[PDB]
Structure 1
Amino acid sequence: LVPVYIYSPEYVSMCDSLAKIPKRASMVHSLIEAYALHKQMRIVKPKVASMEEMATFHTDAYLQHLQKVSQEEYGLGYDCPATEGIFDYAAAIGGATITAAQCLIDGMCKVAINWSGGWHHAKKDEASGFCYLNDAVLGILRLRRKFERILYVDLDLHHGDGVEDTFSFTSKVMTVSLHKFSPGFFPGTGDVSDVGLGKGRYYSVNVPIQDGIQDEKYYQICESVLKEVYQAFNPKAVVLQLGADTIAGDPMCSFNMTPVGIGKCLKYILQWQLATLILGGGGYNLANTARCWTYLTGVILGKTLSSEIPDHEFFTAYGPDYVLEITPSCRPDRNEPHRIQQILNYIKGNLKHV
């Protein structure tokens, strides 16, 4: 009944070294610790993923290449620099999510959290969008050993293309992604008409959304889709990716959400009372990402947190207001109601086939 919190000092330090988000893992953990939330959770040390565990998804040629560049193509480049920490980072993140999955299998908990996971872009032999290894896929494949139908819900700002593509030809894993979809915006995929292929047709769900969406409309959309998905797909377990790059104040400056709105989505999923693997993802206003995942941990624990950020290691990063709540930016919501309705009707039509 007590949620599992994947953590070790070594893991945080490892994750802290991803050059795109320096120290973010420490900031998230430190704030969670400052609110004393870890004492209400079962703290589980993550294992490091073995080569064989990583090879359940990634090809050996790809994994050997990561090993090679870590010691001395494949999507390595501007977004995914080939640096020496690559292989150990992959094994650690993957291992953490696999550990969370295993805890859920063993019935240790109903909810297991790896805030440093959620790297949804990576494919079997291609790095993409800061993702060297797809830990979300790894967790789904582990859960698959016990659970017959798995629902993957992706609330990151970006389309969960790596996870959806991996399971596009299957009906045993359904992917649902809400994301910004606009020509030029990474990764450029995930229109409402993308529904999966072959036996998996209608088992991929995409909700293309525009800039400026706020809490109430987002939840209305998310609740509407998830309601139909639940009744049509009847999932036995859930993997939930909660990238905080949708949150107001993110330098990506696209959606205009607060952790409260995401929390309502989280609450809706939690009341299904299924085994649920919780993952992080994007989130580039580092203090806000910590504010968000701290609040969401509170939501998982059913606790209401004090508005004042406690003094702690990174306290100075929480200016100018030093509170946990995030105020939406004063800019317009570019989502026109009729288009949103069209999308919801298209999805509903798709789910009748499921």
Structure 2
Amino acid sequence: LVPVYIYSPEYVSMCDSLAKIPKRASMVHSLIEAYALHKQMRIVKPKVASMEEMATFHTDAYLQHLQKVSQEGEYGLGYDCPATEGIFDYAAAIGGATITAAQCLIDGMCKVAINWSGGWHHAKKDEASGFCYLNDAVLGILRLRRKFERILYVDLDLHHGDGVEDAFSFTSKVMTVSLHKFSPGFFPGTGDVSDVGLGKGRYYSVNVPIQDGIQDEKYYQICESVLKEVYQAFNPKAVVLQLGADTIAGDPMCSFNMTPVGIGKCLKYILQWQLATLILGGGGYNLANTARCWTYLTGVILGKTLSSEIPDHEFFTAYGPDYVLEITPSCRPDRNEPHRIQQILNYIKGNLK
């Protein structure tokens, strides 16, 4: 009944090695521990994914190439996803952790299982993309489908959850919902509100394009409106929730103007459904703020209010100069015009009935 927390020292050390987010996994874990939240969770060591498990989504040829590059030094590698030594073992660890979380849920060990180091939502069956070499979210959804008939995937990262959406574009058994920045030239370029899925999957992809500067109140109003409609229309049996913290004020992506409180309200709205829920991280490039966000959201999962004062711990100096948990929104414009948001929400509302 207690939430599962996917963690081991070797897993955190592996995750600390991704160059866009050095030490982020240790920062997240050590802040969670500084707030004593691990004592309220069941710690489960992640398994490493086998190539057989990875091949439930990724192609045989992509997995051969990933292994080759990982040993030696095409398929989306080189720029955002450099072809570097060890990438296959890193992929296998992250994929394995999300699979392990899903297995805990299908086994009934818990109703919430947390892998903050997962959420690599851009990777495609045969292409690395957007820092993502393996789509652990897809692998977790596929594992949940062993026991749960309909899976709802909700993606609150700043970026469109394109790889997950594409994986399930043609099916009605998985519904994907992404809220994201959508603007010319902004990665990955997809996910306008008219992106609804294909074939029998038509209307089983939902996309909410949002502009710079959104704040907690409006974001929650949007998310709540969409999720209420999705729940009633789709009746999910399990949820996979990607909580990339690159929406939070102070992120180098410098787009949205959110705080963890607003994301937390979205999370609580989903938790009220009392379904098996797999919690993932994702983006989040202000490392201390990402740790603040995911620690706060762990508290939300546990029903716990945390002290504003960051407890002393190994990474204390990263939390200066304020050393508090709350994040102050920046002073920038909210570029979301009310009547454009109305148009977006009304379109989605009609598509879901």
Fold conserved (TM > 0.5)? yes
| Structure 1 counterpart of 2:246 | 245
Once residues 80 and 253 of structure 2 are traced to their aligned partners in structure 1, the CA distance between those partners, rounded to angstroms, is: 15
- What do residues 140-194 of structure 1 show as CA deviations (whole Å, max 9, x unaligned)? 0000000000000000000000000000000000000000000100000000000
Once residues 126 and 12 of structure 1 are traced to their aligned partners in structure 2, the CA distance between those partners, rounded to angstroms, is: 25
Once residues 212 and 85 of structure 1 are traced to their aligned partners in structure 2, the CA distance between those partners, rounded to angstroms, is: 38
Determine what percentage of the aligned residue pairs are the same residue.
100
Once residues 317 and 202 of structure 1 are traced to their aligned partners in structure 2, the CA distance between those partners, rounded to angstroms, is: 43
For normalisation by structure 1, the TM-score amounts to: 0.99
Q: Matches of residues 239-318 of structure 1 in structure 2 within 5 Å?
A: 239-318=240-319
Once residues 21 and 267 of structure 1 are traced to their aligned partners in structure 2, the CA distance between those partners, rounded to angstroms, is: 27
Once residues 76 and 313 of structure 1 are traced to their aligned partners in structure 2, the CA distance between those partners, rounded to angstroms, is: 35
- What do residues 22-66 of structure 1 show as CA deviations (whole Å, max 9, x unaligned)? 110000001001001001000000000011000000011111111
Displacement of 1:258 in angstroms is: 0.3
| Structure 2 counterpart of 1:62 | 62
Structure 1 runs, 4 residues or longer, greater than 4 Å off? none
Displacement of 1:207 in angstroms is: 0.1
- What do residues 73-114 of structure 1 show as CA deviations (whole Å, max 9, x unaligned)? 000011000001210010000000000000000000000000
Once residues 85 and 327 of structure 1 are traced to their aligned partners in structure 2, the CA distance between those partners, rounded to angstroms, is: 38
Once residues 273 and 301 of structure 2 are traced to their aligned partners in structure 1, the CA distance between those partners, rounded to angstroms, is: 13
Point out where structure 1 has 5 or more consecutive residues left out of the alignment: none
Once residues 348 and 183 of structure 1 are traced to their aligned partners in structure 2, the CA distance between those partners, rounded to angstroms, is: 25
Q: Secondary structure at the match of 1:269?
A: helix
Once residues 280 and 257 of structure 1 are traced to their aligned partners in structure 2, the CA distance between those partners, rounded to angstroms, is: 16
Once residues 298 and 158 of structure 1 are traced to their aligned partners in structure 2, the CA distance between those partners, rounded to angstroms, is: 25
| Structure 1 counterpart of 2:171 | 170
Displacement of 1:332 in angstroms is: 1.0
Once residues 48 and 41 of structure 1 are traced to their aligned partners in structure 2, the CA distance between those partners, rounded to angstroms, is: 21
Q: Secondary structure at the match of 1:246?
A: coil
For normalisation by structure 2, the TM-score amounts to: 0.99
Once residues 313 and 190 of structure 1 are traced to their aligned partners in structure 2, the CA distance between those partners, rounded to angstroms, is: 40
- What do residues 232-279 of structure 1 show as CA deviations (whole Å, max 9, x unaligned)? 000000000000000001011100000000000000000000000000
Once residues 324 and 302 of structure 2 are traced to their aligned partners in structure 1, the CA distance between those partners, rounded to angstroms, is: 20
Once residues 226 and 52 of structure 1 are traced to their aligned partners in structure 2, the CA distance between those partners, rounded to angstroms, is: 34
Q: Matches of residues 23-38 of structure 1 in structure 2 within 5 Å?
A: 23-38=23-38
Once residues 252 and 118 of structure 1 are traced to their aligned partners in structure 2, the CA distance between those partners, rounded to angstroms, is: 17
Once residues 68 and 352 of structure 2 are traced to their aligned partners in structure 1, the CA distance between those partners, rounded to angstroms, is: 44
Aligned length: 352
Q: Secondary structure at the match of 2:301?
A: helix
- What do residues 3-33 of structure 1 show as CA deviations (whole Å, max 9, x unaligned)? 0000000000000000111110000001001
Once residues 177 and 325 of structure 2 are traced to their aligned partners in structure 1, the CA distance between those partners, rounded to angstroms, is: 29
| Structure 1 counterpart of 2:14 | 14
Displacement of 1:349 in angstroms is: 1.0
Once residues 275 and 71 of structure 1 are traced to their aligned partners in structure 2, the CA distance between those partners, rounded to angstroms, is: 38
- What do residues 200-241 of structure 1 show as CA deviations (whole Å, max 9, x unaligned)? 000000000000000000000000000000000000000000
